[PDB]
Amino acid sequence: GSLTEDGLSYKEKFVVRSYEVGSNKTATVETIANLLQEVGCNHAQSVGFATTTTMRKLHLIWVTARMHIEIYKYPAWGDVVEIETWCQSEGRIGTRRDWILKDSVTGEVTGRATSKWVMMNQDTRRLQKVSDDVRDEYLVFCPQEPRLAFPEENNRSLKKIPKLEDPAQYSMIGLKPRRADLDMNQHVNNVTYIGWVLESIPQEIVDTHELQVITLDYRRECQQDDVVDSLTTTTSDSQFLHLLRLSGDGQEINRGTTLWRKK
Amino acid sequence: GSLTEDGLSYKEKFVVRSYEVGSNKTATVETIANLLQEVGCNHAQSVGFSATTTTMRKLHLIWVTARMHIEIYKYPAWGDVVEIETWCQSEGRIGTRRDWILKDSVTGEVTGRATSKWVMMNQDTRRLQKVSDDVRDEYLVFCPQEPRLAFPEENNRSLKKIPKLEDPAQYSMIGLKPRRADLDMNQHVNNVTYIGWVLESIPQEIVDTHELQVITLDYRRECQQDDVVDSLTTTTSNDSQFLHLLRLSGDGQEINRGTTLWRKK
Ligand SMILES: O=C(Nc1ccccc1)Nc1cccnc1
Numbered sequence: 310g311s312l313t314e315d316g317l318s319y320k321e322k323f324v325v326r327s328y329e330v331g332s333n334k335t336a337t338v339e340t341i342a343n344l345l346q347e348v349g350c351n352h353a354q355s356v357g358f359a360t361t362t363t364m365r366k367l368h369l370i371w372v373t374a375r376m377h378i379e380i381y382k383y384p385a386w387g388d389v390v391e392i393e394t395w396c397q398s399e400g401r402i403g404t405r406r407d408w409i410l411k412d413s414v415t416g417e418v419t420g421r422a423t424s425k426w427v428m429m430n431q432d433t434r435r436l437q438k439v440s441d442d443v444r445d446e447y448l449v450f451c452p453q454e455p456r457l458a459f460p461e462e463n464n465r466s467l468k469k470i471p472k473l474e475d476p477a478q479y480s481m482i483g484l485k486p487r488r489a490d491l492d493m494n495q496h497v498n499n500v501t502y503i504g505w506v507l508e509s510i511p512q513e514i515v516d517t518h519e520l521q522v523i524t525l526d527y528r529r530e531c532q533q534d535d536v537v538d539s540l541t542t543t544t545s546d547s548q549f550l551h552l553l554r555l556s557g558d559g560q561e562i563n564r565g566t567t568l569w570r571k572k
Numbered sequence: 573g574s575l576t577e578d579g580l581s582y583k584e585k586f587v588v589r590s591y592e593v594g595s596n597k598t599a600t601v602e603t604i605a606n607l608l609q610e611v612g613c614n615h616a617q618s619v620g621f622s623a624t625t626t627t628m629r630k631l632h633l634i635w636v637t638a639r640m641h642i643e644i645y646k647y648p649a650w651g652d653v654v655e656i657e658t659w660c661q662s663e664g665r666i667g668t669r670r671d672w673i674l675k676d677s678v679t680g681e682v683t684g685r686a687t688s689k690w691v692m693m694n695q696d697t698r699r700l701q702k703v704s705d706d707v708r709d710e711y712l713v714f715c716p717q718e719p720r721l722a723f724p725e726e727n728n729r730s731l732k733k734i735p736k737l738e739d740p741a742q743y744s745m746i747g748l749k750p751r752r753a754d755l756d757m758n759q760h761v762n763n764v765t766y767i768g769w770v771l772e773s774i775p776q777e778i779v780d781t782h783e784l785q786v787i788t789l790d791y792r793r794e795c796q797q798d799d800v801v802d803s804l805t806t807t808t809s810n811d812s813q814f815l816h817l818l819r820l821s822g823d824g825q826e827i828n829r830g831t832t833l834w835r836k837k
């Protein structure tokens with residue numbers, strides 16, 4: 310990987326692996342999400358970072374509040390996928406990380422993603438506004454003019470998500486993370502939540518349709534010893550409403566929507 | 573990746589990813605196992621497989637793992653480049669063996685090694701069988717003729733019998749189920765997922781104070797995507813050794829058995 314000529318974005322090529330593909334011999338949305346997370350970490354490494362000289366002195370961390378991914382063509386096993394990522398301040402609210410996925414051979418855009426990040430004290434777990442020091446050190450690595458992966462005014466990534474009303478049409482109960490689901494800080498990987506949302510989608514849908522759009526809100530983090538229940542109801546192409554909650558008290562951890570197109 | 577000058581082995585370099593590392597900022601044994609499986613697939617692709625031969629496809633025969641043995645000396649850190657070399661070898665009518673050598677791309681030193689035993693099986697009836705002459709000749713043109721062993725030692729750890737864990741287990745992890753990310757392109761549970769399930773019942777205090785050095789895993793039965801697994805562990809022993817057992821949550825049907833050797837950090 311490498312930063313572009315202007316230093317305001319980062320590019321990396323990936324060869325799709327045999328264990329990264331699904332039943333259609335193409336990469337899964339979780340493999341795609343892992344790659345967006347990989348190019349995001351390599352972009353932060355190349356510019357001297359989530360950890361900053363001001364966030365580290367205050368014990369502040371960036372936490373995902375929302376993820377939106379739109380895939381037009383999933384790369385096949387052995388294909389090369391080029392990803393371009395960049396950051397942007399959004400005033401005091403937080404930061405946004407956007408991605409463009411391209412087919413390395415044709416140059417065609419095959420996907421796009423956007424994510425919203427909020428500040429939080431790592432010890433207290435309390436949300437915060439972005440102060441003037443972290444904002445100043447971020448604007449040196451970000452384009453000053455707005456650069457949006459989803460430019461459309463009032464697009465799908467900015468739409469509110471309702472709460473699934475019981476009873477759910479479909480469900481997957483007793484979902485638990487294992488060590489491969491944790492990251493280097495022993496926290497559940499944000500990609501694992503995507504897979505848990507999708508566990509309650511019927512296999513008949515997965516076999517006849519392809520995932521086109523997914524929007525995921527992150528409300529609470531699941532601890533390594535927590536148990537999750539994934540719920541799904543058809544709202545309609547096929548559209549679904551999703552809800553992740555703790556198996557016991559019913560505490561909400563995530564909510565989302567998925568759009569699927571017939572193969 | 574590319575086949576070596578002689579065409580009897582395959583080499584591929586891998587940059588270790590941020591999501592592939594554990595609490596020690598180094599690659600997990602499951603990430604390592606996924607990479608051995610990746611270079612194994614790219615070796616089969618480069619020599620003309622789809623990893624079945626023409627005779628195997630005509631008879632509905634597939635290769636199934638019977639045993640996996642991995643020994644790691646140094647786990648590659650996040651961002652490091654790891655070079656892996658793999659090769660196959662016939663073992664008469666018993667089956668085939670795939671061996672690997674892991675090296676640090678910068679220094680050239682060997683940081684790990686692995687060996688695996690594969691048996692022939694009819695994909696439809698699930699019945700195991702001996703390797704026929706025609707199959708043996710088809711892959712011998714891609715294998716070294718002189719023996720080349722990743723674990724050369726006459727009495728080595730990869731050829732030792734594994735006993736069955738006697739109840740009650742010292743530690744346990746119950747209700748382990750595969751999700752879609754645990755299945756492969758044929759909708760079968762990925763053989764690496766079994767390694768993670770074995771390790772789920774190892775205490776977290778062992779994982780935090782020790783490092784996994786050796787793991788031997790026998791594969792007895794395949795877990796279906798709708799099956800539920802129970803992982804069991806008992807300490808058999810500075811180093812720590814464990815006995816492992818994977819079985820179906822209900823009837824107790826055995827799917828895997830193994831051993832792990834851990835050394836103090
Ligand atoms: O992109 C990230 N997470 C993610 C991506 C896709 C889906 C779910 C989660 N993480 C990240 C970390 C450090 C810097 N930039 C990004």
Ligand SMILES: O=C(Nc1ccccc1)Nc1cccnc1
Binds near residue numbers: 612640670688763
């Ligand atoms: O070696 C393989 N699997 C594996 C590796 C390490 C641990 C567990 C499983 N797969 C494979 C498939 C086709 C050709 N060569 C190798």
